């Protein structure tokens, strides 16, 4: 269908514990593919998906160059930010950037993204136009005005609009069997008596790709929200996801309840019954 490439960078200062920690991860859809750790012995962008291993040392070099350059930038910026928000040296802080791009089935552009946050709170973000910035505060305003004068936006768009989609095209061809797959859920159902007058009814969706799934409970066609428990979609650790939904029902009336599973890997929505 439609695809997305996303990078997530995390810089964490460690006062008196040496230099700050930079971690960067890259995903296509729900599949991670690259990593880089300031700490880890390597000091290279490492592959974390098979389709990426085919990439030359020329690829790995530039990727490492890029990432270290940001890491050093963040190093400086961590200090500039304490100066801004008048903070002590002893305290540890976090800089995070999340950037990417979406493409339609065509294989062409949809949107771009670049957003920053300092200590988990929104800092600055590039607008949908990829021409303007939004400053979250008085501090972020100095960064905005700086980036405005540097013409950062133009450069951002150039990547976001071009280079970004171009890599995506490539990663999707080169990694079709992994990335262009649709893994429908393994759907079962469990009953757990909590009384002789009550019982929890569980519905399991396991080993599915992508992570986007919808789990809905129904009592004879009528949608249920009255005493439904839904868990946060979690990963298998093998590159598929897990989600379950539960409901409290009166003993015996177990046959009255139905669960509907909506997933991209399903030709038509599934329905389970006890």
């Amino acid at each position: 269908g439609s695809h997305s490439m996303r990078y997530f960078y995390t810089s964490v200062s460690r006062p008196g514990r040496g230099e700050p920690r930079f971690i960067a991860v890259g995903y296509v859809d729900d599949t991670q593919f690259v990593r880089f750790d300031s700490d880890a012995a390597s000091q290279r962008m490492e592959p974390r998906a098979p389709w990426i291993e085919q990439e030359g040392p020329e690829y790995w070099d530039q990727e490492t160059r890029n990432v270290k350059a940001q890491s050093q930038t963040d190093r400086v910026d961590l200090g500039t930010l304490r100066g801004y928000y008048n903070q002590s040296e002893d305290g540890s802080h976090t800089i995070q950037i999340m950037y990417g791009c979406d493409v339609g089935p065509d294989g062409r552009f949809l949107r771009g993204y670049r957003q920053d946050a300092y200590d988990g709170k929104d800092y600055i973000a590039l607008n949908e136009d990829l021409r303007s910035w939004t400053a979250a505060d008085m501090a972020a305003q100095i960064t905005k005005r700086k980036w405005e004068a540097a013409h950062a936006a133009e450069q951002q768009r150039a990547y976001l609009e071009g280079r970004c989609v171009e890599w995506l095209r490539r990663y999707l061809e080169n990694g079709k069997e992994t990335l262009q797959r649709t893994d429908p859920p393994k759907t079962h159902m469990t009953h757990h008596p909590i009384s002789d007058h009550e019982a929890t009814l569980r519905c399991w969706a396991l080993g599915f790709y992508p992570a986007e799934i919808t789990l809905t409970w129904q009592r004879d066609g009528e949608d249920q929200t009255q005493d439904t428990e839904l868990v946060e979609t979690r990963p298998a650790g093998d590159g598929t996801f897990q989600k379950w939904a539960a409901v409290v029902v009166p003993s015996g009336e177990e046959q009255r309840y139905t669960c509907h599973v909506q997933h991209e890997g399903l030709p038509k929505p599934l329905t389970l019954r006890w």
């Binding site: 890259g26 962008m45 690829y59 530039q62 990432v67 400086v76 910026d77 500039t80 970004c164 890599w167």
Partner: peptide, 10 residues
């Protein structure tokens, strides 16, 4: 692929 320059200081 990651973004190279800009990398403008905040």
């Amino acid at each position: 692929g990651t973004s190279g320059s800009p990398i403008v200081n905040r």
